[PDB]
Design a protein around this ligand. Structure first.
Ligand SMILES: [Ca+2]
Lengths: 237, 235
């Protein structure tokens, strides 16, 4: 009846998407010999993705994998950039694959290994199963299971996604903990009876952008890294 | 070329016969009664398959495989006078062995070698909760855990194989079904998967003859996961 399973958000919470897109974007453009502002490109790509995602959620657009939403959002924002028209379909697939390569924060893999020695661990994020699987494999991020909202064709904070986690691992809400750096996610899981752990990610949107990392009253745990979370949960190995 | 391998679990990777017999023998010892546990595996699977088909044929609303295994245990225990000396709590605990199945000796090394070259995942009929526990307890590494529970069905339903392709994001010809059961490889093959058969001559113990013969439609035929790893260049 204690804590039995931890479920992890992925983007930002475990992986530094900002550094992935910007650093690999810059290499991509530098070799082709054109100037590009990958900070702006990254922010626009995310905004267009989330706008189209919101249209999928509302039913305005037909359901599709997040991989395709990113790929189509990429076509949209590239029209804002004169060099974008020079990028062929294979060039755009290459850029889009970066979202399946998001690199871990330097604390993520060792903290995940420690937590897995004491708990059942699983992802629980909104991205496609295919991309979360590859992110975990490429980052050598250990998990007992890979779950995403794709499996119920939805998105957090939809209660179905949290219930998916409880049904798949076979535990009750009070035996589960949602781990994220996004407060909407923890608020929703807390209302459904989960324990919640907040991981402060002050560089989620790059080294220079202020992010909301302040503690909240309803957090069971407040940590600055997955390693620190493991320490406070007494998780070794 | 090949991108991902999907593994059946019971029999293919883990020895449920020995798990049943040795945990059963432990249960009978503490409670102070004797029982021929060598035949219980056969009985339990039979009762289970019958009750499962009640879910499959729609005679019963969908329920977890672990629940069905728990009810099948009531079924077989009513056939033995010693069954009554296991109360509901004992049967609950006994039924939990299906989340604790012991790997064959070749399973973990073979799985680790294959994962260094390919994406790897379970794809079996049991509950997500049990397969996850089996793999965790047995230190079986995978990139993902999938079971037919995620589409509330069972192999050979094409939805289960499509779940595997949709989840890993690949095409059928880039995927390989790995199993010691021919109905499973037959269905996956017809859907364009590659297939690999692992012969498991002791799946039902040392005293029963099981079908381990090769078939022409098998892309690979092996006697262990380690042997399959060698065939796939995952040395
Ligand atoms: Ca895993």
């Amino acid at each position: 009846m204690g804590l039995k399973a931890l479920f992890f958000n992925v983007q930002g919470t475990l992986v530094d998407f900002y550094s992935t897109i910007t650093r690999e974007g810059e290499a991509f453009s530098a070799v082709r010999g054109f100037q590009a502002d990958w900070t702006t490109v990254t922010e626009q790509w995310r905004a267009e993705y989330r706008s189209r995602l919101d249209q999928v959620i509302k039913g305005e657009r037909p359901w599709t994998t997040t991989d395709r939403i990113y790929r189509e959002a990429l076509d949209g924002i590239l029209a804002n950039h004169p060099w974008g028209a020079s990028l062929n379909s294979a060039d755009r697939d290459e850029l889009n694959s970066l979202w399946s390569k998001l690199i871990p924060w330097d604390d993520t893999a060792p903290g995940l290994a420690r937590l897995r020695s004491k708990y059942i661990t699983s992802t629980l994020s909104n991205g496609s199963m295919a991309s979360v699987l590859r992110i975990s494999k490429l980052g050598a991020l250990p998990f007992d299971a890979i779950l995403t909202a794709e499996l119920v064709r939805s998105s957090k904070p939809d209660p179905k996604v949290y219930q998916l986690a409880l049904d798949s691992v076979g535990i009750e809400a009070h035996q589960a903990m949602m781990v994220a750096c996004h407060k909407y996610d923890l608020q929703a899981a807390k209302r459904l009876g989960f324990k919640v752990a907040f991981i402060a990610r002050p560089f989620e949107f790059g080294p220079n952008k202020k992010v909301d990392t302040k503690p909240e009253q309803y957090f069971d745990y407040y940590a600055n890294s997955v390693v620190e979370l493991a320490g406070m949960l007494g998780a070794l190995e």
